């Protein structure tokens, strides 16, 4: 269960703590950004990228002065300076073109890319239409991990009589727990 | 709005198309895996990692023969062979220790790491208890991108009278669209 189209494109890149995604018209209108703007959207920053001053909602225009309008082009670029400890960040925020340094005490490394997750034939589109489905998704059931862990509930599990309450008052110990005597 | 604890750990790594996450007791019991098992869980495989034979639900025990039980240790490891085009994959699947080659025609690169997303003071835990919150999450409102794009609706937008229907029959053109005459 894994049919992939001959052109599955990249949905995102992760690099020194920033998640980067193509800046679509969907997203440009959704975040009320100018529609001439070319670059990558940064929607999630942690660790080294957040440290460098980089916030979410920011658009990644360039690195080291070279323009990055696509993921493919942004990767190419991280490969170039992957062994460096610093690269420059040209960013678009609130109409200002800011600059930032990104840092790492070993080396920056290559930004790794992702496609949209593999989906089921009968699956429901949770987002506005964007084009034929095989264009971003692989169709099938592998690349799974289904049922998704997060939707599995754990039986709270046996407790000796007079156990100590780790959690808030939730009700009679006997409703959720199997008691031991 | 960004208070981080002096020990924010890694939640995941992405490497040549696999998303890797610490294999917790939560996840070990949730996927009915042996509880002695040490390694990383692989929950999402695409591109180069899926190509190498790697499926989701798989646990990443080792690379090139070196054991990887934590993210920190798995990164260290990708740094080592980051310039190589091939590394070995020791994996745990259904009780079998399989082996796989991972490949890339330029170079593999460094696996990039992520922490749990920054959360709000008043935010609700969507998962079983796991320990104090500052241990995985940064508390605040930056690293935002809120409101989250996905929860913004776009007004379908004006259509000239006699426009052609791109989408299924949804009802009277006048309910959603502003018509032009
Ligand atoms: C056309 C008929 C479809 C169907 C049935 C689906 N998609 Fe997509 N999809 C894309 C990206 C980048 C995401 C992540 C979320 C986002 O940023 O908007 C998604 C998400 C989904 C889901 C949720 C998947 C999950 O694991 O929860 C599902 C069920 C889904 N899609 C089905 C990317 C694209 C495209 C990129 C240009 C196109 C075209 C489509 N999707 C179209 C469809
Ligand atoms: C203790 C009081 C809390 C609160 C309020 C939250 N967390 Fe966590 N969290 C962790 C990871 C790895 C995730 C991703 C999902 C997963 O794999 O299970 C999450 C998710 C959340 C969310 C959803 C966030 C989102 O962007 O949608 C929220 C609101 C949230 N958490 C709040 C990691 C951990 C831990 C790691 C050991 C611990 C401890 C906690 N979380 C505890 C809390
Ligand atoms: C469901 C409505 C519950 C009621 C009522 C009670 N408990 Fe509970 N408990 C429940 C769950 C789902 C869990 C898992 C952890 C979590 O996220 O809350 C627990 C946990 C405990 C523990 C720790 C378990 C462990 O590490 O093995 C103990 C010792 C415990 N609970 C005891 C307890 C007592 C004494 C209660 C009533 C006076 C009680 N629980 C209520 C679910 C529910
Ligand atoms: C809501 C209940 C709707 C009804 C009824 C109709 N339309 Fe629609 N339309 C709607 C949305 C949210 C969108 C965005 C794209 C999507 O994911 O479906 C659209 C799209 C169109 C388009 C393309 C828009 C563009 O690219 O500019 C056209 C030309 C269009 N719709 C026309 C149309 C006609 C003629 C309808 C009734 C006979 C009609 N729509 C119904 C929402 C809804």
Cβ-based contacts of A107 with chain B (< 8 Å): 79, 110
Nearest to A56 by CA among A71, A34, A41, A38: A41
List, in sequence order, every residue forming a beta bridge with A82; answer none if it has no partner.
none
CA-nearest residue for atom 22, ligand 4, is B166
Biggest CA-to-CA distance, chain B: 71
Q: Which atom of ligand 3 is nearest to the CA of A162?
A: 35
Q: Which atom of ligand 2 is nearest to the CA of B133?
A: 1
Cα–Cα distance, A33 to A19 (Å, whole number): 19
Q: How far is the CA of A146 from the centre of ligand 2 (A)?
A: 20
Cβ(B75)–Cβ(B123) below 8 Å: no
Cα–Cα distance, A68 to A43 (Å, whole number): 16
Give the side-chain half-sphere CA count within 13 A for B84.
Answer: 14
Structure resolution in Å? 2.8
Which ligand minimizes its atom distance to the CA of B23?
A: 2
Cα–Cα distance, B42 to B59 (Å, whole number): 6
Cα four-point dihedral sign B6, B7, B8, B12: positive
Cβ(B14)–Cβ(A114) below 8 Å: yes
Ligand 1 site, residue A116, Cβ cutoff 6 A: yes
CATH number of the domain bearing residue A41? 2.30.42.60
The total number of structural domains in chain A stands at 1
Q: Are B110 and A82 in contact (CB < 8 Å)?
A: yes
Cα–Cα distance, A17 to A49 (Å, whole number): 5
Biggest CA-to-CA distance, chain A: 71
DSSP A43-84: EEE-HHHHHTT--TT-EEEEETTEE--SHHHHHHHHHHTTT-
Cα four-point dihedral sign A139, A144, A150, A153: positive
Q: Which value, in Å, is the radius of gyration of the alpha carbons in chain A? A: 23
Cβ(B62)–Cβ(B76) below 8 Å: no
Q: What is the three-class DSSP state of B99? A: strand
* Residue B22, domain extent: 1-181
Cβ(B42)–Cβ(B56) below 8 Å: yes
Residue B166 is encoded by which pair of tokens? 């791109």
Cα–Cα distance, B87 to B89 (Å, whole number): 7
């Amino acid at each position: 269960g894994g049919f992939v189209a001959p052109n599955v494109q990249f949905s995102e890149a992760h690099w020194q703590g920033m998640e980067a995604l193509p800046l679509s018209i969907e997203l440009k209108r959704k975040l009320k950004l100018p529609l001439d703007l070319e670059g990558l959207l940064i929607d999630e920053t942690s660790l080294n990228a957040a440290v460098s001053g980089l916030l979410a909602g920011d658009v990644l225009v360039a690195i080291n002065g070279r323009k990055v309008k696509t993921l493919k082009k942004m990767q190419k670029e991280t490969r170039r300076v992957q062994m460096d400890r610093r690269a420059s960040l040209t960013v678009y925020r609130k109409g200002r073109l800011l600059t930032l340094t990104l840092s790492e005490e070993k080396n920056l490394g290559l930004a790794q890319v992702e496609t949209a997750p593999m989906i089921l034939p009968g699956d429901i589109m949770p987002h506005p239409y964007r084009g034929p489905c095989t264009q971003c998704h692989a169709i099938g059931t592998t690349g799974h991990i289904t049922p998704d862990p997060d939707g599995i509930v754990l039986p709270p599990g046996p407790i000796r009589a007079g156990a100590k309450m780790p959690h808030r008052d939730r009700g009679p110990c006997a409703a959720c727990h199997a008691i031991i005597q």
